[PDB]
């Protein structure tokens, strides 16, 4: 049991922005990217909790046939300093030998909060190793790190530099034309239905996330 090609309504008008940073390093590096421009690898997905990124990252791996990974924010960082480093180091060397690979990271705000009153130094150890390992992969490593969070302003401004994290894509709350495909997916598994269209019921559910 895996996800289909799109499988999420209300995102097909913006799913190309996440997609176009993937095939263009691999499908055409001779006439399109051999001018002398390094491939950007750091994207940033965010939005309200419930827009479905966690999946959206699964959909681009199924549509391209690339290897998929899963790293949760408060899960790996809750281990020891040497234990979280060993899981971080063994994930990137595994992603090198099966290019193309997608390294999905979630909940960046728990790993890198703002430094206005958050005293103590236990958070800056792991985020210094993330910016370290994002540098020495310049030549042919078809890797795109996907950082998942909720608010873009809660992330530290040091992560938004050249080569570290450039793309800030935001999948939004769909309208009645967008959420109609979400109702079409979760009703085709049903046996029968009424003789009333689902767009008449989805018209009043405007501010309802998918």
């Amino acid at each position: 049991n895996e996800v289909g090609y799109d499988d999420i309504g209300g995102c097909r008008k913006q799913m190309a922005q996440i997609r176009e940073m993937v095939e263009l390093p691999l499908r055409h590096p001779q006439l399109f990217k051999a001018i002398g421009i390094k491939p950007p690898r750091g994207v940033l997905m965010y939005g309200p909790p419930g827009t479905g990124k966690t999946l959206m990252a699964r959909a681009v791996a199924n549509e391209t046939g690339a290897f998929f990974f899963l790293i949760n924010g408060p899960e790996v960082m809750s281990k020891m300093a040497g234990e979280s480093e060993s899981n971080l180091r063994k994930a990137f060397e595994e992603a090198e030998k099966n290019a193309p690979a997608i390294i999905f990271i979630d909940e960046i705000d728990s790993i890198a909060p703002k430094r206005d009153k958050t005293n103590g130094e236990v958070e800056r150890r792991v985020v210094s190793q993330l910016l370290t390992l994002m540098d020495g992969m310049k030549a042919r490593s078809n890797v795109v790190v996907i950082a998942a969070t909720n608010r873009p302003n809660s992330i530290d401004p040091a992560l938004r530099r050249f080569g570290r994290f450039d793309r800030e894509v935001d999948i939004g709350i769909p309208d009645a034309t967008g959420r109609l495909e979400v109702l079409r997916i979760h009703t085709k598994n049903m046996k029968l239905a009424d003789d009333v269209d689902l767009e008449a019921l989805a018209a009043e559910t405007h501010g309802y996330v998918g």
Partner: protein
């Protein structure tokens, strides 16, 4: 003061562990940040990665030199490598000048935490030949009782363990003892009087008493099975009665060290036991005692218990004040903190292990003592190999009454044969010292002809031919 020649060589070498560049390194090629810096030889993380369970004391000496000598002024040269004392200072530097009336916390011995020693003096005991210790087990195969011996050997470097000293043994001497089926107990006075003259001949031959062995076999049925399995995980590793004999032997032989304030510290002594493996053979193992706690409390407080795993702690009689001994063990429900308000504390915790082994037969540096290993030993009176001059007609005889020097010198390098000749003291002590040095060293052909041309060797073969 002057230390050993092996101990000074391990001090001069740093023994650093090199590392290579990595993906985690962000620096340039001409540098090192933290991940390709040279590793210290005392880090226990690298030790347990290669299954080394101790930190190789010469590297532990380096990890305390970093704490003694600093980047600051200091101007001290303290070098705090001393035996931690549990005895009570009588003067006490306070108002409680007698211990009968008064004791405070600065002179009171603290409660023993029972933390295991992380460093061993000897890192790996090695042997010379499998035919040498085969004669020791053969003594049990004739009389059926346990044996005892002392190991004479030397020391050299060890390249497997980082900054480690390996223990080499050359020959085994047996003192006269009274054997018994259950255990053994001999008189210490006649052994010490006998061991004084063996240390005389060991000086010119380059030997030193650094070890001892005692047997414990308990044969099962003398058929398919070799021995019983007495020492295992659930049973005792070393009996508490043999801890006492191992503790007195280490205090009699100290190791000279310039870093210690008293002049002697960290004794290099091995205790090996023949006990057998778990399944089916008579494989041996060796452990040595701990210096941190056990080596000093054996002067006042070690008392024998009925259990082989534990030892009883006795009471104080006006000078022998002891602190409480604590250790952690699991209760019926969970794992709890220190419980011991009770005597008979275990002694298997205070032992550090060693790695025994035998070298390969295809190549070696030297062996220096392989003549026959079949000569009758000096104090094997329980066995039949305790012969008089009748054996010298059978053993060497200056072979077939006219011996070739390639076949005559190969028999003369035996340890117990040379120790039997000088007891009669027929030869001069100057001619005897060149006799034993010819048998133990190389290029012996020019000096062996000097021995046969001397009149002392001619009188030895003439007094042997007339006798039986």
């Amino acid at each position: 003061i002057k230390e050993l020649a092996v101990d000074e060589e391990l001090e001069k070498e740093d023994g650093l562990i090199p590392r290579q560049k990595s993906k985690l390194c962000k620096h340039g090629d001409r540098g090192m940040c933290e991940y390709c810096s040279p590793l210290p030889p005392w880090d226990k993380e690298y030790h347990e990665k290669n299954k080394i369970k101790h930190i190789s004391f010469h590297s532990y000496l380096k990890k305390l030199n970093e704490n003694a000598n600093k980047k600051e002024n200091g101007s001290s040269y303290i070098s705090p490598l001393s035996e931690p004392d549990f005895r009570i200072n009588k003067r006490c530097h306070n108002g409680h000048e007698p211990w009968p009336r008064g004791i405070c916390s600065k002179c009171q011995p603290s409660a023993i935490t029972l933390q295991q020693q992380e460093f061993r003096m000897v890192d790996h005991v090695e042997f010379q030949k499998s035919e040498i210790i085969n004669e020791f087990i053969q003594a049990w195969r004739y009389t059926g009782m346990q044996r005892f011996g002392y190991m004479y050997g030397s020391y050299s470097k060890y390249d497997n363990t980082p900054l480690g000293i390996k223990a080499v043994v050359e020959a085994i001497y047996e003192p006269p003892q009274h054997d018994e089926q259950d255990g053994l107990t001999m008189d210490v006075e006649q052994v010490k009087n006998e061991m004084l003259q063996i240390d005389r001949q060991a000086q010119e031959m380059g030997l030193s008493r650094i070890g001892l062995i005692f047997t414990d076999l308990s044969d099962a049925g003398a058929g398919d099975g070799s021995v019983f399995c007495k020492r295992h995980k659930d049973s005792f590793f070393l009996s508490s009665l043999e801890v006492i004999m191992a503790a007195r032997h280490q205090t009699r032989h100290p190791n000279v060290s310039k870093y210690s304030e008293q002049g002697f510290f960290s004794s290099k002594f091995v205790t090996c036991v023949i006990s057998g493996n778990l399944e089916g053979e008579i494989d041996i193992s060796s452990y040595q005692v701990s210096t941190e706690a056990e080596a000093l409390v054996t002067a006042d407080m070690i008392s024998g218990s009925t259990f082989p795993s534990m030892a009883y702690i006795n009471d104080t009689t006006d000078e022998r004040y002891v602190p409480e001994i604590f250790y952690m063990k699991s209760n019926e429900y969970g794992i709890t903190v220190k419980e011991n308000a009770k005597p008979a504390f275990p002694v298997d915790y205070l032992l550090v292990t060693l790695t025994h082994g035998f070298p390969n037969t295809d190549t070696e540096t030297n062996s220096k003592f392989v003549s026959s290993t079949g000569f009758p030993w000096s104090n094997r009176q329980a066995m039949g190999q305790s012969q008089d001059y009748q054996e010298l007609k059978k053993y060497l005889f200056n072979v077939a009454s006219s011996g070739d020097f390639n076949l005559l010198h190969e028999k003369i390098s035996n340890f117990h044969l040379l120790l039997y000749i000088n007891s009669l003291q027929i030869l001069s002590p100057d001619e005897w010292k060149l006799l034993i040095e010819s048998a133990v060293k190389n290029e012996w052909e020019e000096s062996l002809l000097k021995l046969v041309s001397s009149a002392g060797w001619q009188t030895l073969v003439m007094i042997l031919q007339e006798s039986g």
